[PDB]
């Protein structure tokens, strides 16, 4: 019994070792990937439409935004992701700041550069993973969206107004105001969208870009990224 308890404890201590190791490993990866990212992004700049093509090739990204937003998503010419845990141990390895630059549309969208930061926060527990949070960042909404822009909506608690509000809140522009601190009143799943960029879109943009170059269009996505076997 006692020996068993000893082992069980030792087991629980081992799982705790593994977590530390994982964190260490992640930090190690982030430090190595850094200088390759600088090299890589410099090449990416030479390519036009790289970001537009990537954000069209990623499958779940579309899930978080309105189809109309793609008019604007297509103006993005640069994306930069800096992981904060490299500047200080205070930050979680999941923390990052993302900068987007949009070239703009004549008479509709203003050319601008926007930077958003995501950090993990905890609320009262030792044994809770934590959630992404952010601060609102100013972005200049396109003219086409005057009707759904939260800053131009007059009757906000109005019944119709409340619906115009919610529509604006489900655009990529709504996401910039996402914070993660007021559930149900903000861009839906703003944390998941944030994760996609750091976890997939920035890291694997090139795989995504190459996915768009298949000679036969029907093969896009075939790459990845129901019958039997009767007898032995």
């Amino acid at each position: 019994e006692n020996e068993h308890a000893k082992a069980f404890l030792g087991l629980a201590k081992c799982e705790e070792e593994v977590d530390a190791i994982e964190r260490e490993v992640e930090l190690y990866r982030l430090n190595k990937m850094k200088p390759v990212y600088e090299k890589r992004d410099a090449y990416i700049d030479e390519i036009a439409e790289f970001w537009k093509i990537v954000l069209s090739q990623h499958v779940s990204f579309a899930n978080y935004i309105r189809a109309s937003d793609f008019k604007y998503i297509d103006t993005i010419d640069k994306i930069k992701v800096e992981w904060l845990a490299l500047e200080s141990e205070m930050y979680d390895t999941r923390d990052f700041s993302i900068t987007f630059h949009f070239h703009g549309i004549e008479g509709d969208f203003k050319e601008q550069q926007v930077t958003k930061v995501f950090q993990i926060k905890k609320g009262k527990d030792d044994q809770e993973d934590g959630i992404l949070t952010s601060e609102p960042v100013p972005i200049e909404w396109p003219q086409s969206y005057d009707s759904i822009n939260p800053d131009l909506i007059k009757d906000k608690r109005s019944p119709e107004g409340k619906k115009k509000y919610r529509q604006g809140m489900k655009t990529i522009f709504g996401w910039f105001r996402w914070t993660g601190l007021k559930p149900g009143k903000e861009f839906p799943h703003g944390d998941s969208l944030a994760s996609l960029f750091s976890e997939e879109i920035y890291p694997f943009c090139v795989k995504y870009y190459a996915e768009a170059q298949r000679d036969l269009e029907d093969e896009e996505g075939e790459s990845g990224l129901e019958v039997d076997l009767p007898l032995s």
């Binding site: 189809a67 298949r214 036969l216 029907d218 790459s223 129901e226």
Partner: protein
Amino acid sequence: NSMSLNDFLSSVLPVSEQFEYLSLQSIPLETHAVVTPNKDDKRVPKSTIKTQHFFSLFHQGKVFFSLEVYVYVTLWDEADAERLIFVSKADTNGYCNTRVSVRDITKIILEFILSIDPNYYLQKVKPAIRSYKKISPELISAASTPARTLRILARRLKQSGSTVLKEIESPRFQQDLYLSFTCPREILTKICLFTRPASQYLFPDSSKNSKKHILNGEELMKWWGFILDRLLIECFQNDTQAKLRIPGEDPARVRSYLRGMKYPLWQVGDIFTSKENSLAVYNIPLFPDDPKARFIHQLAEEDRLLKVSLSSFWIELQERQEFKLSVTSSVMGISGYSLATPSLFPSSADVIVPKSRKQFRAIKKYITGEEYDTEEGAIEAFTNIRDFLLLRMATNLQSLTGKRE
């Protein structure tokens, strides 16, 4: 005669009312047989072609109806050809402002599909596995790594100042990269429907809309039963198989339900029973998200495939967990030939065919990934589908006015 999808739909919609609709279709693909082949069999299909048809109807900027259908064409080297229409899902969200017959809408779309000539799906077919042997230069394919792909782009630029191959869709290449087939326009047609009640099928959380009307299993079966009966009378020849099975129900009741149908040949049973009386695996079709296939898979995972027989199979299936009675589940089948010959070839007006499965899935997702707890979802689906099409495809949903009085 109705010669367009528009012609069919309008006929069944309220007169003077405006409706828009989406008609999405996949590129026909070479695929494995619907029913698993028996090595000890006289014959085997040279090819099986699968195509998915997806439909959504919108009224006043809202989507309230959807229908998902699959169409298999099976080619036998010597044994003719059959086409099988699998009806997978149909749903409503209860957000329609005006009054309509969802039943006749569903029936009419199915007639349209019946009208299509089988050859249409066989003109250009995506190969299950492509061979690039007949082709050099090196091609960027699904298999290519990103690095290889990047390098290829660079060489191409250096050679010609372009990353593209002009001749890629050129006819000789097409002959090499695609398959084509022909077949008698008048062929054996089969329709299989499996009805299992649920709150939502294609409109998540629409169950939460009070306006929506949800059917219990019995109601549902009756609903699909009625549509099929008309299809049989309206578009099928007289001695045609019509089979209905309700698992776990006594046959007098089923036989008695059938007696009531307008078509006089409905029978209790399935359209898969054979003269040879083979095993279950060799007679049962494996469809997407289908009750029969999930269970054939289990029998596979237990090395039972050889063990089960058709009679045993139905019994064994009813036992499984998805089947918690009393709930009414039914399987319906139709086998036979069409009254009129199938001559129709769909047009852009008739359907939108995306360039890839990826693009096909993206559009569909706007409808099926939405939340319909509130009306906002119905509107959103309409909004995305429209904005996405125009934006990425320079396309519009079809527009029409109801003619029926």
